[PDB]
Specification:
Keywords: ATP-binding, Metal-binding, Nucleotide-binding, Signal, Stress response. Belongs to the heat shock protein 70 family. This is Heat shock 70 kDa protein. GO terms for molecular function: ATP binding; ATP hydrolysis activity; ATP-dependent protein folding chaperone; heat shock protein binding; metal ion binding; protein folding chaperone. One of its GO terms (biological process) is protein refolding. With about 375 residues, the chain is α+β, with helices and mostly antiparallel strands. It has a domain of about 80 residues: Alpha-Beta Complex (Actin, Chain A, domain 4). Helices cover about 35% and strands about 25% of the residues. It is built from eleven helices and 18 strands. The strands form five sheets. Strands 1, 2, 3, 4, 11 and 12 form a six-stranded mixed β-sheet that branches. It has a four-stranded mixed β-sheet with strand order 15-14-13-18, sandwiched between helices. Strand 11, helix 4 and strand 12 form a beta-alpha-beta unit. Helix 3 crosses helix 4, helix 5 crosses helix 11 and helix 6 packs across helix 8. The structure holds AMP phosphoramidate (AN2). The site of AMP phosphoramidate has 22 residues, from helix 6 and helix 7. AMP phosphoramidate binds next to helix 6 and helix 7.
Protein backbone atom coordinates (compact mmCIF):
# COMPACT_ATOMS: atom_id res chain seq x y z
CA UNK A 1 0.00 0.00 0.00
CA UNK A 2 2.76 2.49 0.94
CA UNK A 3 4.69 3.66 -2.18
CA UNK A 4 7.85 5.84 -2.22
CA UNK A 5 9.59 7.83 -4.95
CA UNK A 6 13.36 7.29 -5.29
CA UNK A 7 15.75 9.45 -7.27
CA UNK A 8 18.67 6.99 -7.79
CA UNK A 9 21.33 9.61 -8.62
CA UNK A 10 24.86 9.31 -10.00
CA UNK A 11 26.43 10.93 -6.91
CA UNK A 12 23.35 11.38 -4.56
CA UNK A 13 20.04 9.58 -4.06
CA UNK A 14 16.84 10.93 -2.47
CA UNK A 15 13.61 9.38 -1.15
CA UNK A 16 10.19 11.00 -0.86
CA UNK A 17 6.69 10.07 0.13
CA UNK A 18 3.45 11.72 -1.01
CA UNK A 19 0.59 11.39 1.42
CA UNK A 20 -2.58 13.41 1.54
CA UNK A 21 -1.39 15.50 -1.43
CA UNK A 22 1.75 16.63 0.41
CA UNK A 23 5.31 15.50 -0.31
CA UNK A 24 7.79 14.76 2.49
CA UNK A 25 11.47 14.31 1.49
CA UNK A 26 12.83 11.91 4.09
CA UNK A 27 16.10 12.70 5.99
CA UNK A 28 18.53 9.85 6.70
CA UNK A 29 20.26 8.81 10.03
CA UNK A 30 22.59 11.78 9.83
CA UNK A 31 19.73 14.27 9.10
CA UNK A 32 20.71 14.49 5.40
CA UNK A 33 17.84 14.91 2.91
CA UNK A 34 20.02 13.26 0.16
CA UNK A 35 22.35 10.24 0.56
CA UNK A 36 25.54 9.54 -1.40
CA UNK A 37 25.19 6.70 -3.95
CA UNK A 38 28.33 5.09 -2.36
CA UNK A 39 28.90 1.53 -1.18
CA UNK A 40 32.10 0.65 0.73
CA UNK A 41 33.55 -2.67 1.93
CA UNK A 42 35.98 -2.84 4.89
CA UNK A 43 37.67 -5.66 6.90
CA UNK A 44 34.51 -5.75 9.13
CA UNK A 45 31.51 -4.06 7.47
CA UNK A 46 29.53 -2.99 4.35
CA UNK A 47 28.85 0.78 4.53
CA UNK A 48 26.23 2.60 2.45
CA UNK A 49 25.62 6.32 1.96
CA UNK A 50 27.23 8.92 4.20
CA UNK A 51 29.33 6.34 6.11
CA UNK A 52 30.73 5.02 2.78
CA UNK A 53 31.50 8.48 1.30
CA UNK A 54 33.13 9.64 4.58
CA UNK A 55 35.78 6.87 4.50
CA UNK A 56 36.41 7.01 0.68
CA UNK A 57 39.86 8.65 0.96
CA UNK A 58 40.98 6.07 3.58
CA UNK A 59 39.71 3.07 1.54
CA UNK A 60 39.70 4.12 -2.17
CA UNK A 61 40.01 0.63 -3.67
CA UNK A 62 36.93 -0.73 -1.87
CA UNK A 63 34.64 2.32 -2.02
CA UNK A 64 32.30 2.04 -5.00
CA UNK A 65 30.44 4.98 -6.55
CA UNK A 66 29.25 5.90 -10.13
CA UNK A 67 27.56 2.49 -10.60
CA UNK A 68 24.86 4.48 -12.57
CA UNK A 69 27.53 5.01 -15.28
CA UNK A 70 27.90 1.20 -15.58
CA UNK A 71 24.30 -0.03 -14.98
CA UNK A 72 22.88 -1.82 -17.99
CA UNK A 73 26.09 -1.36 -19.98
CA UNK A 74 28.43 -3.91 -21.59
CA UNK A 75 31.99 -3.57 -20.22
CA UNK A 76 33.27 -3.08 -23.81
CA UNK A 77 31.28 0.17 -24.36
CA UNK A 78 33.54 3.18 -25.09
CA UNK A 79 31.77 5.03 -22.24
CA UNK A 80 33.08 2.47 -19.72
CA UNK A 81 36.62 2.53 -21.18
CA UNK A 82 36.72 6.31 -20.86
CA UNK A 83 35.01 6.58 -17.44
CA UNK A 84 37.21 3.96 -15.72
CA UNK A 85 40.14 6.42 -15.48
CA UNK A 86 38.05 8.26 -12.85
CA UNK A 87 37.59 5.19 -10.58
CA UNK A 88 40.01 4.05 -7.87
CA UNK A 89 38.09 0.74 -7.69
CA UNK A 90 38.66 -2.12 -10.13
CA UNK A 91 36.15 -2.92 -12.86
CA UNK A 92 36.59 -5.94 -15.15
CA UNK A 93 34.41 -7.63 -17.79
CA UNK A 94 32.63 -10.87 -17.03
CA UNK A 95 32.15 -13.78 -19.46
CA UNK A 96 28.61 -12.45 -20.19
CA UNK A 97 30.16 -9.03 -21.12
CA UNK A 98 28.68 -7.36 -18.02
CA UNK A 99 30.89 -5.18 -15.78
CA UNK A 100 32.11 -6.75 -12.51
CA UNK A 101 33.18 -4.36 -9.74
CA UNK A 102 36.01 -6.00 -7.72
CA UNK A 103 36.53 -5.15 -4.04
CA UNK A 104 38.02 -6.76 -0.90
CA UNK A 105 35.42 -7.41 1.86
CA UNK A 106 36.47 -9.10 5.14
CA UNK A 107 39.79 -10.15 3.58
CA UNK A 108 38.11 -11.79 0.57
CA UNK A 109 37.89 -10.78 -3.11
CA UNK A 110 34.24 -10.05 -4.07
CA UNK A 111 32.68 -9.03 -7.41
CA UNK A 112 29.40 -7.22 -8.02
CA UNK A 113 27.37 -6.28 -11.08
CA UNK A 114 26.46 -2.56 -11.25
CA UNK A 115 22.80 -3.35 -10.46
CA UNK A 116 23.91 -5.18 -7.26
CA UNK A 117 25.72 -2.00 -6.11
CA UNK A 118 22.69 0.12 -7.06
CA UNK A 119 20.39 -2.36 -5.20
CA UNK A 120 22.39 -1.62 -2.02
CA UNK A 121 21.82 2.14 -2.46
CA UNK A 122 18.11 1.47 -3.15
CA UNK A 123 17.93 -0.79 -0.02
CA UNK A 124 19.41 2.10 2.03
CA UNK A 125 16.78 4.53 0.62
CA UNK A 126 14.03 1.94 1.35
CA UNK A 127 15.36 1.70 4.95
CA UNK A 128 15.49 5.53 5.30
CA UNK A 129 11.75 5.66 4.42
CA UNK A 130 10.96 2.65 6.65
CA UNK A 131 12.64 4.25 9.69
CA UNK A 132 10.60 7.44 9.13
CA UNK A 133 7.25 5.67 8.54
CA UNK A 134 7.89 3.02 11.19
CA UNK A 135 6.42 0.49 8.72
CA UNK A 136 7.71 -1.70 5.84
CA UNK A 137 7.73 -0.18 2.33
CA UNK A 138 7.38 -2.46 -0.72
CA UNK A 139 6.27 -0.24 -3.62
CA UNK A 140 8.39 2.39 -5.35
CA UNK A 141 8.76 4.55 -8.46
CA UNK A 142 12.43 4.86 -9.51
CA UNK A 143 13.63 7.56 -11.87
CA UNK A 144 16.22 7.24 -14.67
CA UNK A 145 17.71 9.81 -17.12
CA UNK A 146 15.58 10.34 -20.28
CA UNK A 147 18.41 9.01 -22.48
CA UNK A 148 18.63 5.63 -20.62
CA UNK A 149 18.05 2.77 -23.05
CA UNK A 150 16.01 -0.43 -22.46
CA UNK A 151 19.05 -2.24 -20.99
CA UNK A 152 19.82 0.58 -18.52
CA UNK A 153 16.12 0.85 -17.52
CA UNK A 154 15.71 -2.89 -17.04
CA UNK A 155 18.90 -3.10 -14.96
CA UNK A 156 17.63 -0.21 -12.74
CA UNK A 157 14.31 -2.14 -12.32
CA UNK A 158 16.34 -5.30 -11.43
CA UNK A 159 18.29 -3.24 -8.83
CA UNK A 160 14.92 -2.33 -7.28
CA UNK A 161 13.75 -5.97 -7.24
CA UNK A 162 17.02 -7.07 -5.59
CA UNK A 163 16.52 -4.32 -2.94
CA UNK A 164 13.08 -5.81 -2.10
CA UNK A 165 11.04 -3.15 -3.91
CA UNK A 166 8.09 -3.74 -6.21
CA UNK A 167 8.93 -1.21 -8.89
CA UNK A 168 5.58 0.23 -9.92
CA UNK A 169 7.27 2.18 -12.71
CA UNK A 170 10.54 3.54 -14.04
CA UNK A 171 9.99 7.20 -15.09
CA UNK A 172 12.22 9.90 -16.65
CA UNK A 173 14.08 12.28 -14.35
CA UNK A 174 13.05 15.47 -16.27
CA UNK A 175 9.43 14.32 -16.31
CA UNK A 176 9.59 13.67 -12.52
CA UNK A 177 10.92 17.23 -11.95
CA UNK A 178 8.07 18.68 -14.04
CA UNK A 179 5.45 16.57 -12.15
CA UNK A 180 6.92 17.91 -8.85
CA UNK A 181 5.97 21.47 -9.86
CA UNK A 182 2.42 20.48 -10.88
CA UNK A 183 3.12 21.73 -14.41
CA UNK A 184 0.95 18.82 -15.75
CA UNK A 185 -2.10 20.13 -13.86
CA UNK A 186 -1.79 23.98 -13.77
CA UNK A 187 -2.80 25.22 -17.24
CA UNK A 188 -4.71 22.97 -19.76
CA UNK A 189 -2.89 24.58 -22.75
CA UNK A 190 0.31 23.28 -24.34
CA UNK A 191 3.38 24.07 -22.23
CA UNK A 192 7.03 23.89 -23.27
CA UNK A 193 9.13 23.07 -20.21
CA UNK A 194 12.93 23.20 -20.05
CA UNK A 195 14.53 21.04 -17.31
CA UNK A 196 18.08 22.26 -16.53
CA UNK A 197 19.64 19.46 -14.42
CA UNK A 198 23.22 20.05 -13.23
CA UNK A 199 24.21 17.48 -10.57
CA UNK A 200 27.54 16.23 -9.20
CA UNK A 201 28.76 14.49 -12.33
CA UNK A 202 26.33 15.03 -15.20
CA UNK A 203 24.50 17.85 -16.96
CA UNK A 204 21.14 17.12 -18.63
CA UNK A 205 18.89 19.57 -20.45
CA UNK A 206 15.49 18.23 -21.52
CA UNK A 207 12.74 20.02 -23.38
CA UNK A 208 9.28 18.63 -22.60
CA UNK A 209 5.82 19.40 -23.96
CA UNK A 210 2.74 19.03 -21.76
CA UNK A 211 -0.65 18.92 -23.44
CA UNK A 212 -3.59 17.66 -21.33
CA UNK A 213 -1.60 16.00 -18.50
CA UNK A 214 0.62 14.16 -20.97
CA UNK A 215 4.40 14.85 -20.92
CA UNK A 216 6.50 14.15 -24.01
CA UNK A 217 10.30 14.52 -24.10
CA UNK A 218 10.85 16.48 -27.36
CA UNK A 219 14.64 16.94 -27.18
CA UNK A 220 17.51 16.17 -24.79
CA UNK A 221 21.16 17.28 -24.70
CA UNK A 222 23.87 17.91 -22.10
CA UNK A 223 27.28 16.63 -21.10
CA UNK A 224 27.72 13.32 -19.20
CA UNK A 225 30.97 14.71 -17.72
CA UNK A 226 30.06 18.19 -16.54
CA UNK A 227 28.85 18.62 -12.96
CA UNK A 228 29.80 19.92 -9.54
CA UNK A 229 32.83 17.57 -9.34
CA UNK A 230 34.35 19.51 -12.28
CA UNK A 231 33.92 22.86 -10.40
CA UNK A 232 35.61 21.21 -7.34
CA UNK A 233 38.48 20.17 -9.70
CA UNK A 234 38.88 23.82 -10.80
CA UNK A 235 39.45 24.79 -7.14
CA UNK A 236 41.78 21.76 -6.61
CA UNK A 237 43.93 22.72 -9.69
CA UNK A 238 44.14 26.32 -8.38
CA UNK A 239 45.10 25.23 -4.80
CA UNK A 240 47.74 22.80 -6.15
CA UNK A 241 49.35 25.75 -8.01
CA UNK A 242 48.91 28.09 -5.04
CA UNK A 243 50.66 25.55 -2.73
CA UNK A 244 53.57 25.40 -5.25
CA UNK A 245 53.96 29.25 -5.18
CA UNK A 246 53.88 29.26 -1.35
CA UNK A 247 56.06 26.20 -0.63
CA UNK A 248 59.04 26.33 -3.05
CA UNK A 249 57.49 24.31 -5.89
CA UNK A 250 56.24 21.35 -3.77
CA UNK A 251 53.62 19.35 -5.73
CA UNK A 252 50.53 18.15 -3.80
CA UNK A 253 49.28 16.33 -6.93
CA UNK A 254 52.04 13.69 -6.45
CA UNK A 255 50.11 12.40 -3.35
CA UNK A 256 46.61 11.09 -4.20
CA UNK A 257 45.52 11.16 -0.53
CA UNK A 258 46.54 14.87 -0.31
CA UNK A 259 44.47 15.53 -3.47
CA UNK A 260 41.36 13.74 -2.06
CA UNK A 261 41.57 15.68 1.22
CA UNK A 262 42.01 18.96 -0.73
CA UNK A 263 39.05 18.05 -3.01
CA UNK A 264 36.81 17.48 0.07
CA UNK A 265 37.58 21.00 1.34
CA UNK A 266 37.23 22.53 -2.15
CA UNK A 267 33.66 21.19 -2.46
CA UNK A 268 32.81 22.62 1.03
CA UNK A 269 34.15 26.07 0.04
CA UNK A 270 32.21 25.88 -3.26
CA UNK A 271 28.93 25.30 -1.36
CA UNK A 272 29.67 28.25 0.97
CA UNK A 273 30.27 30.48 -2.08
CA UNK A 274 26.62 29.87 -3.16
CA UNK A 275 25.44 32.02 -0.17
CA UNK A 276 28.60 33.98 0.86
CA UNK A 277 31.02 36.27 -1.05
CA UNK A 278 34.11 34.45 0.36
CA UNK A 279 35.15 31.07 1.75
CA UNK A 280 38.27 29.50 3.26
CA UNK A 281 39.88 26.29 2.01
CA UNK A 282 41.94 24.81 4.82
CA UNK A 283 43.75 21.46 5.09
CA UNK A 284 46.01 20.93 8.10
CA UNK A 285 49.13 18.83 7.23
CA UNK A 286 48.07 18.58 3.57
CA UNK A 287 51.43 17.53 2.07
CA UNK A 288 54.82 17.07 3.72
CA UNK A 289 53.22 18.04 7.06
CA UNK A 290 52.62 21.56 5.68
CA UNK A 291 49.32 23.26 6.55
CA UNK A 292 47.39 24.79 3.67
CA UNK A 293 45.08 27.79 3.87
CA UNK A 294 43.60 30.07 1.15
CA UNK A 295 40.67 32.49 0.85
CA UNK A 296 38.52 32.17 -2.30
CA UNK A 297 36.15 34.97 -3.31
CA UNK A 298 32.95 34.13 -5.28
CA UNK A 299 34.49 36.30 -8.08
CA UNK A 300 37.63 34.03 -8.24
CA UNK A 301 35.46 30.86 -8.24
CA UNK A 302 33.34 32.38 -11.05
CA UNK A 303 36.57 33.23 -12.96
CA UNK A 304 38.02 29.67 -12.60
CA UNK A 305 34.70 28.15 -13.76
CA UNK A 306 33.75 30.90 -16.31
CA UNK A 307 33.92 28.80 -19.49
CA UNK A 308 32.27 25.76 -17.89
CA UNK A 309 29.39 27.88 -16.54
CA UNK A 310 28.76 29.73 -19.85
CA UNK A 311 29.00 26.46 -21.82
CA UNK A 312 25.96 25.10 -19.93
CA UNK A 313 23.90 27.29 -22.34
CA UNK A 314 25.19 25.34 -25.38
CA UNK A 315 22.98 22.23 -24.66
CA UNK A 316 20.08 24.64 -23.95
CA UNK A 317 20.51 26.13 -27.47
CA UNK A 318 20.87 22.59 -28.89
CA UNK A 319 17.53 21.28 -27.45
CA UNK A 320 15.71 24.40 -28.68
CA UNK A 321 17.21 23.90 -32.18
CA UNK A 322 16.29 20.12 -32.19
CA UNK A 323 12.74 20.90 -31.03
CA UNK A 324 12.50 23.69 -33.68
CA UNK A 325 11.53 26.35 -31.11
CA UNK A 326 12.58 29.82 -29.93
CA UNK A 327 13.68 30.42 -26.29
CA UNK A 328 10.68 32.81 -25.95
CA UNK A 329 8.36 29.76 -26.37
CA UNK A 330 9.64 28.11 -23.12
CA UNK A 331 6.85 28.53 -20.49
CA UNK A 332 8.87 27.22 -17.49
CA UNK A 333 12.58 26.63 -16.78
CA UNK A 334 13.01 24.14 -13.89
CA UNK A 335 16.33 24.09 -11.97
CA UNK A 336 17.27 20.52 -10.91
CA UNK A 337 20.57 19.18 -9.45
CA UNK A 338 22.61 20.45 -6.56
CA UNK A 339 24.86 22.60 -8.77
CA UNK A 340 21.93 24.83 -9.83
CA UNK A 341 22.37 26.53 -6.38
CA UNK A 342 25.40 28.40 -7.85
CA UNK A 343 24.29 32.03 -8.27
CA UNK A 344 26.28 32.54 -11.51
CA UNK A 345 24.52 29.56 -13.14
CA UNK A 346 21.08 30.88 -12.14
CA UNK A 347 22.01 34.35 -13.52
CA UNK A 348 23.33 32.91 -16.80
CA UNK A 349 20.07 30.93 -17.36
CA UNK A 350 17.88 33.94 -16.43
CA UNK A 351 19.80 36.23 -18.82
CA UNK A 352 19.56 33.62 -21.59
CA UNK A 353 15.79 33.43 -21.13
CA UNK A 354 15.51 37.26 -21.18
CA UNK A 355 14.87 37.73 -17.45
CA UNK A 356 12.41 34.87 -16.94
CA UNK A 357 12.58 33.56 -13.37
CA UNK A 358 13.34 29.83 -13.25
CA UNK A 359 11.26 27.50 -11.05
CA UNK A 360 13.55 26.71 -8.10
CA UNK A 361 11.14 26.65 -5.13
CA UNK A 362 11.75 22.92 -4.62
CA UNK A 363 15.36 22.11 -3.29
CA UNK A 364 16.91 21.26 -6.65
CA UNK A 365 18.56 18.06 -5.40
CA UNK A 366 15.06 16.87 -4.16
CA UNK A 367 12.80 17.83 -7.14
CA UNK A 368 13.22 14.44 -8.92
CA UNK A 369 12.42 12.35 -5.78
CA UNK A 370 9.51 14.75 -5.12
CA UNK A 371 8.00 14.05 -8.59
CA UNK A 372 8.63 10.29 -8.31
CA UNK A 373 6.84 10.34 -4.93
CA UNK A 374 3.83 12.09 -6.52
CA UNK A 375 3.76 9.48 -9.31
CA UNK A 376 4.09 6.62 -6.78
CA UNK A 377 1.03 7.88 -4.89
CA UNK A 378 -1.00 8.24 -8.12
CA UNK A 379 -0.07 4.70 -9.21
CA UNK A 380 -1.14 3.45 -5.75
CA UNK A 381 -4.67 4.93 -6.07
CA UNK A 382 -4.10 8.15 -4.12
CA UNK A 383 -5.36 11.14 -6.17
CA UNK A 384 -4.80 13.71 -3.36
CA UNK A 385 -1.87 15.56 -4.98
CA UNK A 386 -4.28 16.52 -7.89
N1 LIG B 1 24.97 24.96 -2.15
C1 LIG B 1 25.55 24.41 -3.23
N2 LIG B 1 26.32 25.12 -4.10
C2 LIG B 1 26.98 24.54 -5.13
N3 LIG B 1 26.95 23.23 -5.37
C3 LIG B 1 26.20 22.42 -4.55
C4 LIG B 1 25.45 22.97 -3.42
N4 LIG B 1 24.81 21.95 -2.80
C5 LIG B 1 25.11 20.83 -3.51
N5 LIG B 1 25.92 21.12 -4.54
C6 LIG B 1 26.54 20.20 -5.50
O1 LIG B 1 25.57 19.37 -6.09
C7 LIG B 1 26.21 18.19 -6.57
C8 LIG B 1 25.31 17.00 -6.28
O2 LIG B 1 24.04 17.32 -6.82
P1 LIG B 1 22.86 16.24 -6.76
O3 LIG B 1 21.74 16.81 -7.61
O4 LIG B 1 22.60 15.79 -5.38
O5 LIG B 1 23.67 14.96 -7.33
P2 LIG B 1 23.27 13.96 -8.50
N6 LIG B 1 24.04 14.37 -10.00
O6 LIG B 1 23.75 12.53 -8.07
O7 LIG B 1 21.79 13.90 -8.60
C9 LIG B 1 27.54 18.12 -5.84
O8 LIG B 1 28.57 18.42 -6.77
C10 LIG B 1 27.49 19.24 -4.83
O9 LIG B 1 28.76 19.88 -4.60
Amino acid sequence: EVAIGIDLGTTYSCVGICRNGVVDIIANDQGNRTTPSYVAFTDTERLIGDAAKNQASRNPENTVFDAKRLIGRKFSETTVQSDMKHWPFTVKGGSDGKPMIEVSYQGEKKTFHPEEISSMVLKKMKEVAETYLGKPVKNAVITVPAYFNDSQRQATKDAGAIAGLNVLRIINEPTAAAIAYGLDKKGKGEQNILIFDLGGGTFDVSLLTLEDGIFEVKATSGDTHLGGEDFDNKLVNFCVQDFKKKNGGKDVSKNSKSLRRLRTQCEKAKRVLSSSAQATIEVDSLFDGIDYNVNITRAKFEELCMDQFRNTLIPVEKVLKDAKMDKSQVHEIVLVGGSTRIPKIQQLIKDFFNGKEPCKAINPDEAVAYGAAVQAAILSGDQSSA
